[PDB]
Amino acid sequence: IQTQQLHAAMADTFLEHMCRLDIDSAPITARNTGIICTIGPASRSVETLKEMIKSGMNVARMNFSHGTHEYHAETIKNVRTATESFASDPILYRPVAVALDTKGPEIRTGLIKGSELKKGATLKITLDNAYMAACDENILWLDYKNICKVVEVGSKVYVDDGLISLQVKQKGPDFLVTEVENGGFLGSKKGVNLPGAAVDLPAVSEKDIQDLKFGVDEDVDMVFASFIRKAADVHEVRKILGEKGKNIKIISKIENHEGVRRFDEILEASDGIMVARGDLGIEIPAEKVFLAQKMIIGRCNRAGKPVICATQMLESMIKKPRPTRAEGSDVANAVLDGADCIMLSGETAKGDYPLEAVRMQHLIAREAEAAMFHRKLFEELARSSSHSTDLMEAMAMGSVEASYKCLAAALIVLTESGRSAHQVARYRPRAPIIAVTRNHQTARQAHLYRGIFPVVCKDPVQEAWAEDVDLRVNLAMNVGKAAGFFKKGDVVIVLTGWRPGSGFTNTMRVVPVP
């Protein structure tokens, strides 16, 4: 009994690869898939924060659909304080990224009276700012001022995670009379969803404009933009960002139909993507969700752009320690699907078991990462890029191939720009990728890329390239051994440059571990 499910990796047919999976075949020490965690009241604390890091958190999310700049910044300080707390040990310091989550076109309910359930009976919506204080079972206030121009008589309306379905029956300039199809206990400040109606709310709102620019000041590494349908919308966020936020990544989250419908354009303009299941679910018929998930992920893999899979990956775990049999198939399959990053929203913010959440995202990810059919995968991926004759593409391809043959312990890529490493992760190797940069943004952002295990060089630049290179290499070397990625006489591929100002890692080597 082999390890890393290698007996399955040998199969000729997919069926045989599945047939060959073994519960008793041990995964490796490293984790390739990233884990994006959404911080909230349950995980804001520096002590809570650090342990979260130590558990496995890579990226820290900041949901701006809720929150004051004051609150967000505190969240930030903290994230970096727990982050830089480990910084005195170079070989065991884990860089952590920070991400902003925008609130694009987002209808949200009003407030309920300080004294709210609904039956298969009638209710009425109001936009007049007077019932906003008192939102009784009989009356509700929407955030959207242009609601009566979008929806028609018979048109359905959803709220509180599509949990409550409202059928439309009547109109008015300042109203809408609606019946309850599927109703229950209506909360306070729940968001509505208008599937099959056109939201005319701007992609980028004053608040979003405000929120974004602030990101620029907080040195956030990437922006998760909500509700993207067009590419022109992607542009707008780039504009709002400007030169200062030149180096920030723009990950478009698909939440609508138009979004799935106009994905190529979006993909191009984007720098990453996010499958925002929580919203799309409401937006498109939920039975259709998996289809849009795989299309998306597959398309992003073929393209070389990082992709995120989120919303309700381990819900149940919010109140309960152990996930469900389906929570676990969801997360495992998502890794198989080939998502470069998984993510927790409820389980790590509101959550009662925050850490226990991260831990299982990590355990499931390791097992699902080896279940992958790396041989077919790379052939299937090589074929697609067959049109490209890039040099790094070539060099990435080689390295991955050669790591399959000699069963490498890891791939060590010395980058700055982080491109070279990006380019190799793209080739879905089966071993960890140790990227070594002196650039911080680069390290922090490298999480977005599957397989990449960033390390950062605090050491000055030395005179001889040869020695600088051997300087960085060594570190990689040292850091793998400690983390335990590889032992004393293991083999490992190294990718560097021949001479400075190389532009790309054009030198490959097969160097045993000292």
Strand partners, 249: 222
468 is in an annotated binding site: no
Residue 248 C-beta: closest distance to Mn ion, Å = 20
Residue 253 C-beta: closest distance to K ion, Å = 8
64 is in an annotated binding site: yes
Residue 65 C-beta: closest distance to K ion, Å = 4
Q: Give whichever of 293 and 403 is closer to Mn ion, judged by the CB atom.
A: 293
Strand partners, 471: none
65 binds, among K ion, Mn ion, none (CB under 5 to 8 A by kind): K ion
Nearest to 381 by CA among 401, 409, 403, 364: 401
Q: Give whichever of 69 and 383 is closer to K ion, judged by the CB atom.
A: 69
Among 279, 315, 347, 369, contact with Mn ion (rule: CB under 5 A): 279
State the catalytic residue, choosing from 75, 109, 311, 348.
311
Amino acid of residue 243: E
The burial of 463, by beta-carbon neighbours within 10 Å (0-12 exposed, 13-18 middle, 19 or more buried), is given as exposed
Among 45, 55, 65, 478, contact with K ion (rule: CB under 5 A): 65
Q: Which H helix or E strand runs over 181?
A: strand 175-182
Residue 66 C-beta: closest distance to K ion, Å = 8
Q: Give whichever of 101 and 340 is closer to K ion, judged by the CB atom.
A: 101
61 is in an annotated binding site: yes
Q: Per the structure block, which two tokens stand in for 263?
A: 């994905």
Nearest to 221 by CA among 198, 199, 247: 247
- Per rule CB under 5 A, count of chain residues that contact Mn ion: 1
311: annotated active-site residue:
yes
Residue 99 C-beta: closest distance to K ion, Å = 11
Q: Per the structure block, which two tokens stand in for 385?
A: 């890029």
470 is in an annotated binding site: no
437: annotated active-site residue:
no
Going residue by residue from 237 to 276, which x/- string records binding to Mn ion, judged by CB under 5 A? ----------------------------------------
- Per rule CB under 5 A, count of chain residues that contact K ion: 4
506 is in an annotated binding site: no
**SS3 call for 32:** coil
Strand partners, 70: none
Residue 101 C-beta: closest distance to K ion, Å = 4
279 binds, among Mn ion, K ion, none (CB under 5 to 8 A by kind): Mn ion
Is residue 506 near K ion by the rule CB under 5 A?
Answer: no
Residue 39 C-beta: closest distance to K ion, Å = 13
270 binds, among Mn ion, K ion, none (CB under 5 to 8 A by kind): none
Cβ atoms within 10 Å, residue 269: 18
Amino acid of residue 164: I
502 is in an annotated binding site: yes
Q: Give whichever of 279 and 337 is closer to Mn ion, judged by the CB atom.
A: 279
32 binds, among Mn ion, K ion, none (CB under 5 to 8 A by kind): none
366: annotated active-site residue:
no
Task: State whether the Cα torsion 157-160-161-164 is positive or negative.
Answer: negative
- Sole residue written with tokens 């992003």: 300
253 is in an annotated binding site: yes
416 is in an annotated binding site: yes
61: annotated active-site residue:
yes
Q: Give whichever of 279 and 347 is closer to Mn ion, judged by the CB atom.
A: 279
- Cβ–Cβ under 8 Å, residues 133 and 111: yes
74 is in an annotated binding site: no
Q: Per the structure block, which two tokens stand in for 126?
A: 């109001």
- Cβ–Cβ under 8 Å, residues 82 and 46: yes
State the catalytic residue, choosing from 31, 61, 444, 450.
61
One DSSP character per residue, 427-477 reads T--SS-EEEEES-HHHHHHHTTSTTB--EE--SPPPS-HHHHHHHHHHHHH
Cα torsion for 138, 152, 187, 127, to the nearest 10°? Answer: -70
State the catalytic residue, choosing from 253, 426, 428, 450.
253
Is residue 279 near K ion by the rule CB under 5 A?
Answer: no
Residue 416 C-beta: closest distance to Mn ion, Å = 35
Going residue by residue from 93 to 112, which x/- string records binding to K ion, judged by CB under 5 A? --------x-x---------
Amino acid of residue 39: I
221 binds, among K ion, Mn ion, none (CB under 5 to 8 A by kind): none
State the catalytic residue, choosing from 44, 50, 80, 108.
108
d(CA 411, CA 403): 8
253 binds, among K ion, Mn ion, none (CB under 5 to 8 A by kind): none
Q: Give whichever of 237 and 475 is closer to K ion, judged by the CB atom.
A: 237
Strands in 164-172's sheet, in edge-to-edge order, are 139-141, 122-126, 175-182, 164-172, 156-159, 192-193
CB-based closest residue to Mn ion: 279
d(CA 496, CA 107): 50
Amino acid of residue 77: K
- Cβ–Cβ under 8 Å, residues 271 and 246: no
> What HEC string does 66-125 produce?
CCCHHHHHHHHHHHHHHHCCCCCCHHHCCCCEEEEECCCCCCECCCCCCCCECCCCEEEE
The catalytic residue positions are: 61, 108, 253, 311
The site for Mn ion (CB under 5 A) is made up of: 279
Could you tell me which residues are annotated as the binding site for ATP? 63-66, 108, 190
Annotated binding-site positions for substrate: 61, 253, 278-279, 311
Q: What residues make contact with K ion under the rule CB under 5 A?
A: 63, 65, 101, 103
Q: Which residue numbers belong to the known binding site?
A: 58, 61, 63-66, 94, 101-102, 108, 190, 253, 255, 278-279, 311, 415-420, 447, 465, 472, 499-504
Binding residues for L-serine: 58, 94, 447
